Structure 1
């Protein structure tokens, strides 16, 4: 059985290789997730075929409860595994299974170095420094649905100063931090990627929430627990650390 692996283009997890050499099939791609999939394939002993998710979506449910993205590919048995920066969530576990996480992360703060700012609390209690998140993203949602005192205050601020505090996308938010007095609330993994490539930027404080990326499978898949096992082996043997360093480290 050659396993069909659904994934999504997302730097540095999955990218097309910068080459015009005759590369076909899986060889057309590179990235953290391709390296992970190669390790998993070697530990478990499976053949695989990477297919980009046709609709280019991660997987969310509509008003009717219909799914899309990588999640929908698993539900429909069009893919055996989803190997991507796909967050393990309560709603997704209702319809697919997941391995234990190969990466853990949490919302954090992206801002300039040299400022006395050291946490979310420092931001919340002031208005001189603008702060927000990508509009309608996972981070915005967290703040909007939160019942934690300080995050409700930060949300009230982000929403009332909506037109300006909430940006269109990560790229723009990064631009906003580099050119104005602004702090962007973003997923720690993305922040680490950006800070490695821009010495003027830094992460502020620790993690605000906590979640993990796991390999998705259809419910009942016999590969799920085997993938968890392989993930634990790779972590313990320092391989996930090396694979992260390979893709995240900058100049």
Structure 2
């Protein structure tokens, strides 16, 4: 066959390949997820056709409870697999299958090096260093929904003053950390990408939660089990580690 793979542009998982002339088909894209897709293809033996998700969304439910994004593409059988940094959540797991995670991670703190701040507790107990998250992002939502005291206090601070401590998107957030006295709460995968490329920034403290990214399949897929096993094989052989360093290691 040719499997249709839904995916989404997200640096450095899936990016348009630099070119001086128009590119076509799978040659338009490169990145960690394209390399993962290639390894999966080699192990399981399938051909594939990468299609960016038309609405540019990962997948969530609206007020009606209808799904969108890559999740919807799988539900509607317009895609055979989603190979993207798609977070495994029980709400999605109800409607699609997920492989074993190919990346495990958690929320953490991006800030400057050389300071006395060593945890979320240290941020929460003060107000001089501003801190926040990308508005309407996965991490902001974690804080908004937390029932843990420290994280409730943090959300109160973040959501205070008309949410001035929140940012529009990740690049704005990263530049806010660089230019001002500000700490950004974000997924640790994104933090490591930034700290690899900005020597004066660091992850502060450990991970505040745990989550993982998995390959999405429609429920009933003949590829479900085989994908999990292939990811286990790639982890054991050190290949996931190699592909991560390929795309994350920076200047």
Q: What band does the TM-score fall into relative to the shorter chain?
A: over 0.9
**What SS does the aligned partner of 1:5 have?**
strand
Note the C-alpha offset of 1:242. 0.4
Give the Cα–Cα distance (whole angstroms) in 2 for the partners of residues 214 and 163 of structure 1. 32
Cα distance per residue 1:219-240 (max 9 Å; x no partner): 1111111000000110110000
How far has the Cα of 1:178 moved from its partner? 0.5
Distance (whole Å) between structure 2 residues aligned to residue 211 and residue 42 of structure 1: 27
Shift in Å at residue 20 of structure 1? 3.1
- Counterpart secondary structure, 2:87: coil
- Residues 219 and 104 of structure 1, relative CA distance in 2, 3 Å threshold: same
Corresponding residue number in structure 2 for 1:200 = 200
Please list every run of at least 4 consecutive aligned residues from structure 1 whose deviation after the TM superposition is greater than 2 angstroms. Answer: 20-24
Q: Deviations over 1:74-107 (max 9, x none)?
A: 0000000000010000110111001010001100
Deviations 1:35-55 (Å, cap 9, x if unpaired)? 000000000001110000011
The aligned length equals 251
Instruction: Give 1:15-34 correspondences, 5 Å limit.
Output: 15-20=15-20, 23-34=23-34
Corresponding residue number in structure 1 for 2:7: 7
Structure-2 change in CA distance of 1:22 and 1:178 (3 Å)? closer
Q: Deviations over 1:115-165 (max 9, x none)?
A: 011110110111111011011111111011111111111111111134321
Distance 1:177 1:145 in 2: 24
Matched residue of 2:196: which SS?
helix
Cα-Cα RMSD: 1.0
Deviations 1:171-192 (A, max 9, x none): 1111110011110000000000
Aligned to 1:174: 174
